Symmetry: D2
Subunit: 349 residues, 4 copies
């Protein structure tokens, strides 16, 4: 094969430097990039009207929490609307984030679409005009991006088509980001839905991540200028067999060691529906796993950072500080967890 380099040394340095800042020791990501339809559910859960101002205020509440979160938060993923909103003091939210030591991220996918001829499987759209969007987002303060693909474990899923196509579109997204100075977070989420056990999740995760990294290679992606946002390896939500956090950690770290090249700068786990505590305990067990882990293992959490804060807020401005305190408590917990410092046989894998 013949090299026509995708990136200059200067471009590589920029991307690697950004990626490393996001996942520096003790740091993880606040995933605050819920679309309006997704944040509508959460505001509904606290009897709060889904208005642009309430969304602004709620995002403000998280982003302006006090300086205790600064060493915990290496990056914040925003939804488009929020990237262009301002705090009460008039500061653009990206400036707020940066002033606290955080890197600003932007979700750029345009959601899932059905794959015809599959058993309810999807790919993800959003490539059209993405290069121009990335150039604009970079000018407007974002240095990394997020794109979510979704796979499901079932009798006939994930299919060969779903694995190949989601890996391929992730690679296209990553390529476009890197041409524009944006670090792509590659998110091939395997949902926990179903009654499958831990070893089945581990098996599917291994196959998916092998496909992801082959596609990234085929598309000439610079891995040092990327992050990976995978599911932890867990039993299915409905699995009747029970597992310890140490078993979840061993399956997760084993799957990653078998598939993720050491050049990848970091792994920022999604927590899906895990409780706030569950997500911290699992991340902590992952970091205590006694296998060699050549990448940062940290968090990219939404509900696992926000659930208690949202409830404490309750849509009432006078609950601001109480709500922020709940978020700080989870930021501190997960900052400890991504160092193996949180307290509330590998051949079998």
């Amino acid at each position: 094969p013949h090299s026509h380099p995708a990136l200059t040394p200067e471009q590589k340095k920029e991307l690697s430097d950004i990626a490393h800042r996001i996942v520096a020791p003790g740091k993880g990501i606040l995933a605050a990039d819920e679309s309006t339809g997704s944040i509508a559910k959460r505001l509904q859960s606290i009897g709060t009207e889904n208005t642009e101002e309430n969304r602004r205020f709620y995002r403000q509440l998280l982003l302006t929490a006090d300086d205790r979160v600064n060493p915990c938060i290496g990056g914040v993923i925003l939804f488009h609307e929020t990237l262009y909103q301002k705090a009460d003091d008039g500061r653009p939210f990206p400036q707020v984030i940066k002033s606290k030591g955080g890197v600003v991220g932007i979700k750029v996918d345009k959601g899932v679409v059905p794959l015809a001829g599959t058993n309810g499987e999807t790919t993800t759209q959003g490539l059209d005009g993405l290069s121009e969007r990335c150039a604009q987002y970079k000018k407007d303060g974002a240095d990394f991006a997020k794109w979510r693909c979704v796979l499901k474990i079932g009798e006939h899923t994930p299919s060969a088509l779903a694995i190949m196509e989601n890996a391929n579109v992730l690679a296209r997204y990553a390529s476009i980001c890197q041409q524009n100075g944006i670090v792509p977070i590659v998110e091939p989420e395997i949902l926990p839905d179903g009654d499958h056990d831990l070893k089945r999740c581990q098996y599917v995760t291994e196959k998916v991540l092998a496909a992801v990294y082959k596609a990234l290679s085929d598309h000439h992606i610079y891995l040092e200028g990327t992050l990976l946002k995978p599911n932890m390896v867990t039993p299915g939500h409905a699995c009747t067999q029970k597992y310890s956090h140490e078993e979840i950690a061993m399956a997760t770290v084993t799957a990653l060691r078998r598939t993720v090249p050491p050049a990848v700068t970091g792994v920022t786990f999604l927590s899906g529906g895990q409780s706030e505590e569950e997500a911290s305990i699992n991340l902590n067990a992952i970091n205590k796993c006694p296998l060699l882990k050549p990448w940062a293992l940290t968090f990219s959490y939404g509900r696992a950072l926000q659930a208690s804060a949202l409830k404490a807020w309750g849509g009432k401005k006078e609950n601001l500080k109480a709500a922020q305190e709940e978020y700080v408590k989870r930021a501190l917990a997960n900052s400890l967890a991504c160092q193996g410092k949180y307290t509330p046989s590998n051949h079998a894998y």
Copy 2:
């Protein structure tokens, strides 16, 4: 693998019936889907201002040419703008086309974009929201679509990445079309640029089309409900070796026989920069090639149907009939050519 049928028998019948109508014996396609920027080059060549009204009048001139074209024209590919324009008598252009026995087609890609890490290679964008666009276009009178991928022959091209990715995006586009009752024309154009010879073009065409049909299989595409729009197999533009039309025909038909399943309903060749006469003579020779050809071999021509008509028009309303006459003459010529009736060893392939 497990079947979760992409299409019902009723959906398949609709797509197969449309595809067969377009390429019925003696019929081919007027490719009139030049974007505003693309048609600008045309109108500039005749000192005509690139306004919507001038574009409307020119498209009208072609679409309302007299009834002699009806048995020649099985389909017309339109650009979005034109699908929603009307002739002077108030008739929507899709109604004009249908009243003359033509199927209405719509170009749906959003142009090429660069593949990072390649020697100037591209893929094509346009999948975002494509399902909704197809449903709307179907409602508004279109029954087939076009999507153009572009590959180039050079020292290191087409690369494995470019072949793989362009084949994959063609398959996604085809899948989405078929879910919405739209027959996709799959266009993997290999440009004739360069100094390569006929056998190099044949080799690359064979490899590209094998990749295209494997991707269509992987994505569960119903081939009977598709058409193929390939390059003919020709020497490169800068090649100094001379070849006969019979050699071009043999290389073209051999390449297609080696790659295109008989289930594909028809092949509608692009002619690129070929002269009007060259494109007709080549197509005629292709149809006279003594090898077995289990698909229709016809035309999807732009300049090869329009060049003399555009010149005779000159932007002047009073040249209407003179311009229409030149177009009619080429429609008649190519209708004969796609039957092997136009007049102005295989182991070596």
Copy 3:
């Protein structure tokens, strides 16, 4: 990609000419390449000892049937042992075959082996030293070869690995054959075992054959110098739903039309465990199917040509003529069937 031609025009002409001779109109293939272990079961079924001489005599019985078979038999696939055996008159069996207008073929695979990490799936071995073996078989009178891959329909099979790997090894085998003047018959057999229905067999057959032809493209195989030996598309053995021969034919031809490039010179169906009559009726229906079929559709039959002959023989020399007559009858039947002359769609 860059062309470094696998084959010269002269090499291509040789392979295309051989391939076309084998499947010329009215002609099919006698598949007589059973391993000794497979033919043992057969000789036992007629109380005949599985000796070298009894195998020789049985193969002689088929190969020296009278000249009525000549327009029926375009090729005969032999097992190694038989390629080097002689008829009673001293003629090598390849000379016997050629003297009757047949092309001689040689089975070259060395059987299936298990794919670790699968649910009982296999690939096929036999590439080692294959080039030198082909060169020798060519000198010894063979002009085509056969290699059998085996796939199974089940809840999780055929797996992506099994499809990928069997397609790849077929392509390697085909490539080596073509370098040595041998036409490869590519046999990706999907077993009929199981209770799946006709559309499931059609779906799997379509996916397998697409993978096969992509692998053949990747390995620079000259399709005009090949033949395909697939399963017909049928319900599984244990399927309770019943289908007509016209439905089997439509599914089979549709699957082939969706995957087999017109450049492939011919399709020579295996019949497996189908009765002699069933195999003829199905092949006839395939050829009467009213879709366009740009390749020869004929037979590569073993038991469907041999079953009644084996019975009439019974291991007894005095039944030679009676046994040969049964074989001739099936050769004639299948010669008619591969022309659509034998008498005893959007839903696809």
Copy 4:
């Protein structure tokens, strides 16, 4: 996809334990598996007749070198013939190797064959009957195997076909070995021939290794029970641009970090035509490279361990001790090199 496990936990433990023993800190591999035709060239260069006894004597000279080599040699790759030969005292050579702390390996490929339709590219044969051969070799004392694929950098090579096919056959070989308790060393050698530069070798090495590990995944290979034997990343032999050992090290380690999952137990470099000292200096620089390296980085050397010993021997029995001393000296040097402790005394964004 559905798991029908290729290996039990016990089988995995056996393979992982073997793999780790071979590449334990300070240890590398003596690659002594030259076929009869290949060793003929070596013996002629010292005017010695290529007889079975001379081959036995030469292999004995290496395998019975004194105990200084024991902490240096974690594994020895043998050719079939040698696996069944005995030392002068009657001990089978596998017992000799084991008694000195080494794991016994067996080369199981049957050589390269040409890929039709390529510019002189090859794949490698040897799968036929390989399972039975592996079971027999395991019984007869071998615990790991070697299989060599060869790729070339040129105008149109390595081609997509060559990359795909060599990766696939390596995966088949690895699968069969692991079913029989044999650790497969996966060797996708990219030859150094040609005038390409360092960044071109790095690029091709990255693409080849990504294909290798995708194939191993597709074939359900247990990476912890494997080793990798790649080329170092170097300029081509005819390249006119000069590079430092630190640049070679950086390019090599970067390429591996970008493709080799951390689960792989170790990387045992081939040295090709590098001189004895060059192969040690480069391996040492690789181990001093200031990037994170989550696998052992050690040697699987033939000529780089044998060249001076072969010369000092000269086919003369009376030169035995002198010849063994030269081998010991290279074993000691490379044991230091694979720890980054070798001395002659005894920007990464640019990649």
